[PDB]
């Protein structure tokens, strides 16, 4: 019980850090997916959003919710 986070804070980083190795991986993790989502909104086919989007949700905030739900997997170089 960590009451509902507001805007930027959600989702919590701790629950996100379980989905990757480090905080730096989480950055690249969500970043590249953000570029992926925005390309899909214009036009090597593009995927997403896997989670039902918000009213005007930004693609970066979508990729963070996706990572929190384990909806994608990444591989580190």
């Amino acid at each position: 019980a960590y009451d509902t986070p507001l805007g930027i804070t959600n989702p919590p980083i701790d629950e996100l850090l379980s989905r990757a190795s480090s905080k730096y991986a989480l950055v690249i993790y969500a970043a590249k997916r953000a570029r992926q989502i925005n390309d899909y909104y214009n036009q090597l086919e593009y995927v997403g959003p896997l989670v039902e989007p918000g009213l005007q949700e930004k693609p970066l905030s979508i990729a963070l919710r996706e990572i929190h739900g384990d909806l994608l997997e990444h591989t580190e170089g």
């Binding site: 925005n38 390309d39 909104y41 214009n42």
Partner: protein, 576 residues
């Protein structure tokens, strides 16, 4: 007077002019005094210029000596008084007049308005004040206003240095000050031709010109926002060699591509006000303007500046802070009178930071505002033994002077709070402790403890929010180095130093750092590409090479050092 060497032979003077005006100077620390003096010469002239309620003897002599006040030369009587000039008919039979500076701009943009204090049929004497200067009232320095003060920490809005004010100070123009800006533009002979300023502009709607006269200069009394046109000027241009897509529209719409380029004066970014006056200097008639210049016009813009959240206030004791918030007069801690307090000052600065005097002029401020009548009929209390006669009684709103190193002493101050006559319907608002039960104007319940209230003399400081706020998305770029720069129409760019780069590295944010140093500052190709990307909504492009680094190689080469990029595969690259 005693000579420096004469000091050895035989056995208030240490105070300066700015320092000698701080009431209760002895109780404040020496370092705080100097800091308080600097802030007195930092104030700005207010429209009303009310005189201090608790001061010292220096205000009168200091004001007239400054020279910004009008003093009668010879004893006599006035003849006629108008805002423009005052004339006095001397008994001697001579006749002297005085033209009053009205809304003259100072060096730093402050207003220098004078006011006449005398009337018709009034006798005057030599060395007597006739008109009030900018920061004077009736002849004494009025650098600020007197405000009701509560010294309670008010729910973090006055946190640690900040201050909260009543909306009254805005409605009543008590802290309002006028500021005047000067703008300049000239027409001279050019290499190609001659500069010409006129209403006609190459590409404009008739609405932007709607505030220009024949000559193309803004008309007096006009309102100007950021980016509006002040003076319309034009300079030769050619060869034009216009782009084909540009001309095709020229033929379609039939607007002939003019032979001259627009160089017109526009009000800087973030400035606004009315146009006071214009000064035009033309070569045609008279006017010694330097070789090349053919005409000059200066525009004077002035603005009433309401006290705004963010501005800086400060007292004479060195205490200064930003206006953190401005609460509606309603939801303000108010005395049992329903009398809202103006500002709310936090107590936290006081602990072992001595500044003790600031609390004394607060109590003496309430004494001077409410009036008093000592109880001396049979008592003649021991504390008033050293006091002078007839100071015993004073009416409401009287002014007081406590010279620095011998002013009111501590014991006397306590007795004065005992005799503190009522407000309109007989009742007492401040106890002998200088405290009162304030009612929280937002909940209605009284504040559980008695709070110190009083009147303090505070000043509006020189630098204001309007001048200090800056923002930029895209603007001018330096020539030698492509890094952004703000010239006319400020648009200046914040500068990201090495220390900031250290922090950025410490976080590990490699991209944020690269972005700041390449595509926001120096990438001649990148900065435009990211702007194009944002508007299209497409992803941000990949940064390039900072122009700073490219220039670095040339600087090494100019020094006879053969720098080679040495790629892994091609082994030799030219930046191009």
């Amino acid at each position: 007077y005693l000579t420096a060497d004469e000091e050895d032979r035989h056995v208030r003077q240490m105070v300066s002019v700015a320092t000698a005006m701080i009431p209760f100077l002895e109780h404040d620390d020496a370092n705080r005094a100097l800091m308080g003096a600097n802030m007195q010469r930092q104030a700005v002239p207010l429209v009303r210029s009310e005189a201090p309620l608790v001061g010292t003897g220096m205000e009168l002599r200091a004001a007239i000596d400054a020279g910004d006040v009008v003093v009668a030369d010879k004893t006599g009587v006035i003849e006629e008084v108008s805002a423009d000039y005052i004339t006095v008919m001397a008994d001697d039979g001579t006749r002297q007049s005085y033209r009053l500076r009205k809304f003259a701009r100072s060096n730093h943009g402050t207003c220098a308005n004078q006011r006449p204090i005398v009337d018709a049929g009034q006798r005057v004497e030599a060395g007597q004040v006739i008109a009030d200067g900018p920061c004077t009232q009736n002849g004494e320095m009025a650098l600020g206003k007197n405000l009701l003060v509560a010294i309670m920490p008010w729910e973090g809005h006055n946190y640690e240095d900040a201050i909260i004010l009543s909306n009254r100070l805005v409605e009543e123009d008590v802290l309002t000050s006028i500021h005047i800006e000067e703008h300049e533009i000239d027409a001279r002979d050019t290499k190609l031709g001659a500069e010409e300023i006129t209403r006609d502009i190459p590409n404009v709607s008739d609405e932007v010109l709607a505030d220009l006269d024949e000559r193309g200069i803004v008309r007096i009394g006009a309102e100007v926002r950021d980016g509006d046109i002040l003076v319309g000027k034009v300079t030769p241009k050619g060869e034009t060699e216009l782009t084909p897509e540009e001309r095709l529209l020229r033929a379609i719409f039939g607007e002939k591509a003019r032979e001259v380029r627009d160089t017109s004066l526009k009000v800087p970014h973030g400035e606004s006000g009315k146009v006071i006056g214009i000064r035009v200097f033309s070569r045609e008639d008279d006017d010694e303007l330097p070789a090349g210049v053919n005409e000059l016009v200066r525009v004077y813009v002035a603005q009433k500046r309401k006290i705004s959240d963010g501005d800086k206030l400060a007292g004479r004791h060195g205490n200064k802070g930003v206006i953190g918030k401005i609460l509606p007069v309603e939801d303000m801690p108010f005395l049992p009178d329903g009398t809202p307090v103006d500002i709310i000052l936090n107590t936290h600065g006081v602990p072992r930071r001595m500044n003790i005097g600031q609390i004394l002029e607060t109590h003496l401020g309430w004494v001077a505002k409410a009036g008093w009548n000592i109880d001396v009929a049979a008592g003649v209390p021991d504390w008033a033994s050293k006091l002078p006669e007839e100071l015993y009684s004073a009416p409401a709103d009287s002014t007081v002077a406590t010279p620095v190193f011998d002013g009111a002493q501590e014991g006397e101050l306590a007795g004065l709070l005992g005799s503190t006559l009522p407000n309109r319907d007989g009742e007492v608002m401040v106890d002998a402790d200088g405290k009162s039960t304030l009612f929280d104007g937002r909940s209605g319940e009284p504040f559980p403890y008695p709070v110190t209230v009083g009147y303090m003399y505070i000043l509006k400081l020189h630098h204001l929010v309007d001048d200090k706020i800056h923002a930029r998305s895209t603007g001018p770029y330096s020539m030698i180095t492509q890094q952004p720069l703000g010239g006319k129409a400020q648009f200046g760019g914040q500068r990201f130093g090495e220390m900031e780069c250290w922090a950025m590295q410490a976080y590990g944010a490699a991209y944020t750092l690269q972005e700041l140093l390449t595509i926001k500052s120096d990438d001649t190709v990148g900065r435009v590409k990211v702007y194009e990307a944002i508007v299209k909504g497409e992803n941000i492009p990949e940064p390039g090479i900072p122009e700073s680094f490219k220039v670095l190689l040339k600087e090494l080469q100019s020094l006879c050092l053969n720098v080679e990029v040495l790629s892994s595969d091609g082994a030799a690259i030219e930046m191009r």
